[PDB]
Design a protein around this nucleic acid. Structure first.
Lengths: 32, 114, 42, 56, 42
RNA sequence: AUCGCUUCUCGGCCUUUUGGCUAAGAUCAAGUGUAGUAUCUGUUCUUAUCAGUUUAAUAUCUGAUGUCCUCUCGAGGAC
């Protein structure tokens, strides 16, 4: 169903999604 | 009763901040004229040496003394550790920074391009 | 034609890569070439 | 492109402008030289032909 | 003596996002065009 | 007012952070047929009996929604 969406997919949303995709920081070297 | 104030300014040279810190530490110290006179009556004229004048090999300190300087060391070290006050992790504003290096580079750019 | 999703990708892509790497950006987008991306930007 | 950086001390800007003029002189004098070699026929090297077409 | 940082339009070595505005910042017309064009219309 | 501790706010460092060069180093980006199932998604339903159709039962579907005066579908009453 093609029909005008509600809010939008503006850029800042993309930049925030990518910044929160924050998995490349990764887990710390394990203390033993 | 007493009153004074000292305002902070530009770090202009590391020397200025060092000097301020020395002022504070110097004002703190309180010396015992007892030990001074005790040390005095032993050595007398040796007390007043020019740069080049007089010489006695070494003055050996009671350990209790050494503890004073060690304690002051730890104090100044802590006070210096607090040099940079960190701004709390505020997520409230818009995020256009991929990581913390990028976030800080964007902040430096904010301060040079208005 | 141009769809708001795409040009909202393009704003971010230009924001990140810079204003001279049109082939990278064009690669972010399906069905766009670097010429059209550059045209839409300018 | 006209290059102008917002707040950048003048001594630095003069240093940079001086050195970019140095490199520009070197670059285009090399272009003149290689073009004469290519025109009269001396080099057949195939990286110089492309480097020189891009310079000119 | 503080030195602004460079944000280039060609190199983004570490892949950093910079807003369009700060990314961006880092004509004459003679008066004889009027006399020529109007002489031509006349 | 002074000293110390704690809480919040703000300023200053924040170079401690964009590996060098060239011909921006170079270049560029091409698939089903049939139905049908399921899942999302979007949406739509108090009204009062009763008769039937129907159904395992519901539902659906069909069909109307006590007289008399009177005042403003509404009201007090002879009933």
């Amino acid at each position: 169903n093609k029909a005008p969406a509600e809010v939008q997919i503006t850029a800042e949303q993309l930049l925030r999604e990518a910044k929160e995709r924050e998995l490349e920081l990764l887990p710390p070297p394990p203390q033993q | 009763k007493k009153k004074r104030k000292n305002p902070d300014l530009g770090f202009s040279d590391y020397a200025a901040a060092q000097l301020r810190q020395y002022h504070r530490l110097t004002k703190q110290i309180k010396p015992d004229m007892e030990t001074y006179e005790r040390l005095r009556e032993k050595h007398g004229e040796e007390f007043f040496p020019t740069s080049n004048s007089l010489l006695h090999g070494t003055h050996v300190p009671s350990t209790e003394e050494i503890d004073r300087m060690v304690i002051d060391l730890e104090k100044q070290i802590e006070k210096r550790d607090k040099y940079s006050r960190r701004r709390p992790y505020n997520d409230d504003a818009d995020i256009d920074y991929i990581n913390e290096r990028n976030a800080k580079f964007n902040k430096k750019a904010e301060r040079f391009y208005g | 034609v141009w769809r708001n999703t795409e040009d909202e990708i393009l704003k971010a892509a230009v924001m990140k890569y810079g204003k001279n790497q049109w082939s990278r950006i064009a690669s972010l987008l399906h069905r766009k070439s670097a010429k059209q991306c550059k045209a839409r930007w300018y | 492109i006209p290059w102008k950086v917002p707040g950048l001390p003048t001594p630095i800007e003069n240093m940079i402008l001086r050195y970019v003029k140095a490199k520009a002189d070197w670059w285009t004098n090399t272009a003149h030289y290689n073009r004469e070699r290519i025109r009269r026929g001396a080099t057949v090297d195939k990286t110089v032909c492309k480097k020189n077409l891009g310079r000119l | 003596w503080k030195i602004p940082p460079c944000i280039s339009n060609w190199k983004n070595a570490k892949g950093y996002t910079i807003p369009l505005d700060k990314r961006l910042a880092a004509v004459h017309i003679n008066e004889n065009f009027a006399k020529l064009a109007e002489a031509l219309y006349i």
